[PDB]
Design a protein around this ligand. Structure first.
Ligand code: ADP
Ligand code: VO4
Ligand code: MG
Length: 691
């Protein structure tokens, strides 16, 4: 039943809103609507209850005008079958239920239609569902390619690239058991005619610190635990290691086992991927050897000879062989590093703290450089040298996160999420309205309040958090307190998004009002994390190493004779300019609850996400504007059938007036007919009714 004026939504204190500041409920005709732009009433609880209702029937995808919202089901669903893949092909958005397969197919459709590169941009916080959705886009394209009209086919290698990468670059955190600890942009290349030709991956900022450090409730990278599972006892013999994670300090500061992850079957999936990817046994064992060496490296003790000297060579010995190095040379490089004196050298001295730091850095450097090499190797086999014309890029970044302890790592992560949200804002609100102005459409610019420019400027612009951190690095006398002091002198009271920390729970130094909330940051060791300096004496031995992998990992290295933040900003800007030259397809992932409960929806958490993403705003610009527009030529070429009674424009004017449609549903532009929501669908439907 229904009551047009009595059925309303009231602001609940614990559940955001509740079925009954009074908003009208939508009629039952619109229950579980596939496109929320077609709801008669549009307010916060209207969108919240349509999403909650669809999620109750396990319908995790839902359209919001031109973009899609997916809510993590936390449970496998039978909607990603190859049968469903084949059915989604060729289908228009309006003639199939919302799905990630529809976003992918329609990006493909626009690519060949417009002769334009596309990009599937997936947003969301930690554990929202970004990586799963990214894998389903690649899965759709590979399955579609593999059906047409040792090392495996291009399609299998593309799929198997991700399990190989997740072992080395993904890890369990407090918010996600398989959190991506690096950004990823994947391009799927096609020829002029649409046949899949090639693929490449570009990875961004792997969280180095995780390799040698873990928080109370989190693990190191999956790979360590997979190896220590003993599902391949041969690997333990090869790496000269025990079967206990608690025997290795670098990998056991936090948790060591995850309930949702079977580390034994995962190592099998990991190894199988390297096989399909074309890797060799020497290649696999070299990466396994290096992973092992990094564990032994962390177990080396030191002592006062203020100068350090090895406290027992047992752990040093094991890692030196796995690396193809001399154990005495390795230890003398750590404790007594060479300093250039023209064509000669003098060693400097180090204390136990200085050697411990140097060792930590070297393991992080080896690990990150191993991941880079691995990505390059995957790229080398994905390179088919077949003719390519276009590409469909997929962006899977590390999601917005807030831990009990937030450091440099969290700042770089959250910065990117703020940057990508601004991409959505600029595309959906600024560029869209400039297109109406361009085509002489009657329109007055709307301010949707979607502009995190102040927060982005605070982080990246000169004298901002990152610019201050870069300048303070290039001062040898600079300390964490001088950086803290510089941040506050320039920004306290001046930058609105920079606040004093809101402190049991670890001590924070400053607050940052991000698009998705206030994040408390601890600036300890940020100067060192940004510098990333290495013991060049040990790096020198690495260059000469008898293990080809370790030698090539460090062959391209520049000595003493650039920072993390400068490189991150450089890559982020390069990425945003390159995405600007594509047709973007936004997928907004929503985490339904903190506790990983499938089918359960926390209303205050979902509504927070929908607000900071701009879902209501993005729906309104679709309703108030004109989301569909066809060139007068492309309109006569397809819709002349409707009424065949010389100019492309004048003919379209007479055609639309001769039809039984609302004459307010369309507007005439300089080169295109701009349609209101749903009118295009009705015109396409009418084309079948006389085809
Ligand atoms: N569509 C989905 N179907 C089933 N489970 C999902 C889906 N998307 C995500 N999950 C679950 O949620 C976890 C976290 O999602 P993930 O894609 O890794 O998040 P993010 O990359 O945004 O941090 C996954 O490991 C998986 O267990
Ligand atoms: O958990 V994430 O993969 O979004 O970092
Ligand atoms: Mg991820």
């Amino acid at each position: 039943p229904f009551d047009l004026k009595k059925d309303v939504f009231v602001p609940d204190d614990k559940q955001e809103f509740v079925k009954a500041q009074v908003m009208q409920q939508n009629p039952p005709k619109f229950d579980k609507i596939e496109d929320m732009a077609m709801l008669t009433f549009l307010h916060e609880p209207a969108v919240l209850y349509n999403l909650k209702d669809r999620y109750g029937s396990w319908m995790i995808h839902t359209y919001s005008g031109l973009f899609c919202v997916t809510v993590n089901p936390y449970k496998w669903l039978p909607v990603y079958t190859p049968e469903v893949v084949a059915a989604y092909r060729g289908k228009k958005r309006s003639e199939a239920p919302p799905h990630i397969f529809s976003i992918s197919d329609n990006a493909y459709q626009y690519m060949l239609t417009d002769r334009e590169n596309q990009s599937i941009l997936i947003t969301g916080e930690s554990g929202a569902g970004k990586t799963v959705n990214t894998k389903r886009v690649i899965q759709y394209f590979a399955v579609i390619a593999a059906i047409g009209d040792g090392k495996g086919t291009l399609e299998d290698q593309i799929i198997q690239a991700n399990p190989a990468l997740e072992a080395f670059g993904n890890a369990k955190t407090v918010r996600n058991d398989n959190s991506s600890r690096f950004g990823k942009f994947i391009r799927i290349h096609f020829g002029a005619t649409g046949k899949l030709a090639s693929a490449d991956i570009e990875t961004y900022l792997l969280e180095k610190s995780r390799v040698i450090f873990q928080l109370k409730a989190e693990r190191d990278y999956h790979i360590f635990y997979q190896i220590l599972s003993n599902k391949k006892p041969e690997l333990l013999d090869m790496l000269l290691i025990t079967n206990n994670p608690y025997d290795y300090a670098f990998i056991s500061q936090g948790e060591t086992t995850v309930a949702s992850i079977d580390d034994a079957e995962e190592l099998m999936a990991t190894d199988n991927a390297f096989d399909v990817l074309g890797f060799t046994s020497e290649e696999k064992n070299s990466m396994y050897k290096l992973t092992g060496a990094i564990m032994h490296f962390g177990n080396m003790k030191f002592k006062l000879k203020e100068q350090a000297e090895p406290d027992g060579t047992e752990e040093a010995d094991k890692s030196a062989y796995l690396m193809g190095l001399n154990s005495a040379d390795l230890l003398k490089g750590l404790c007594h590093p060479r300093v250039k004196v023209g064509n000669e050298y003098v060693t400097k001295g180090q204390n136990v703290q200085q050697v411990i730091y140097a060792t930590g850095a070297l393991a992080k450097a080896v690990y990150e450089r191993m991941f880079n090499w691995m990505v390059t190797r995957i790229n080398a086999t994905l390179e088919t040298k077949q003719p390519r014309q276009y590409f469909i890029g997929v962006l899977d970044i590390a999601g917005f996160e807030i831990f009990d302890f937030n450091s440099f790592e969290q700042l770089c992560i959250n910065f990117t999420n703020e940057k990508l949200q601004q991409f959505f804002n600029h595309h959906m609100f600024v560029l869209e309205q400039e297109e109406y102005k361009k085509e002489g459409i009657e329109w007055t610019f709307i301010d949707f309040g979607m502009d995190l420019q102040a927060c982005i400027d605070l982080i990246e612009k000169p004298m901002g958090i990152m610019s201050i951190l870069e300048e303070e690095c290039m001062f040898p006398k600079a300390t964490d307190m001088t950086f803290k002091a510089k941040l506050f002198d320039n920004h306290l009271g001046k930058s609105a998004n920079f606040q004093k920390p809101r402190n049991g729970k670890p001590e924070a130094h400053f607050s940052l009002i991000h698009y998705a909330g206030i994040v408390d940051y601890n600036i300890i060791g940020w100067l060192q994390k940004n510098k990333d300096p290495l013991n060049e004496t040990v790096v020198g031995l690495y260059q000469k190493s008898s293990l080809k992998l370790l030698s090539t990992l460090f062959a391209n290295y520049a000595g003493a004779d650039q920072t993390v933040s400068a490189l991150h900003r450089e890559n982020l800007n390069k990425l945003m300019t390159n995405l600007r030259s594509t047709h973007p397809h936004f997928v907004r992932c929503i985490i339904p609850n903190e506790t990983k409960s499938p089918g359960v929806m926390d209303n205050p958490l979902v509504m927070h996400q929908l607000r900071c993403n701009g879902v209501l705003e993005g729906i309104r610009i679709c309703r108030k504007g004109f989301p569909n527009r066809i060139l007068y030529g492309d309109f006569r070429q397809r819709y002349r059938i409707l009424n065949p009674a010389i100019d492309s424009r004048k003919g379209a004017e007479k055609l639309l007036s001769s039809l039984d449609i609302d004459h307010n549903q369309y507007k005439f532009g300089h080169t295109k007919v701009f349609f209101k929501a749903g009118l295009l669908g009705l015109l396409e439907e009418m084309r079948d009714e006389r085809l």
